[PDB]
């Protein structure tokens, strides 16, 4: 099948390029902005969601898990980005 990787960005600075395809276990990273804003990020096997996270809006954890080429995540009020992409 697809071979994909998941680029984590914050203010369109890249914080993780996570190869997801053949990925096992459970990885959970924070991404901290400014002030007390945070996203908890999970990557479960081939997938990858917002946990978790402070954000008025809830959009991105509203959003679940990723995993397809062409699959986004967005928080807007903390300008983190998931974007997954074929390689």
């Not at 096992?24 to 902005?33: A, C, D, W």
């Not at 978790?52 to 397809?68: A, F, L, R, T």
């Amino acid at each position: 099948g697809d071979e994909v990787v998941a680029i984590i960005s914050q203010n369109g600075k890249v914080i993780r390029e996570i190869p997801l395809t053949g990925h096992k276990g459970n990885e959970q990273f924070t991404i901290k902005g400014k002030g007390a804003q945070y996203n908890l990020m999970e990557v479960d096997g081939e997938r990858i969601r917002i946990k978790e996270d402070n954000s008025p809006d809830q959009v991105g954890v509203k959003m679940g898990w990723k995993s397809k080429a062409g699959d986004t995540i967005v928080c807007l009020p903390h300008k983190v980005f998931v974007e997954i992409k074929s390689t």
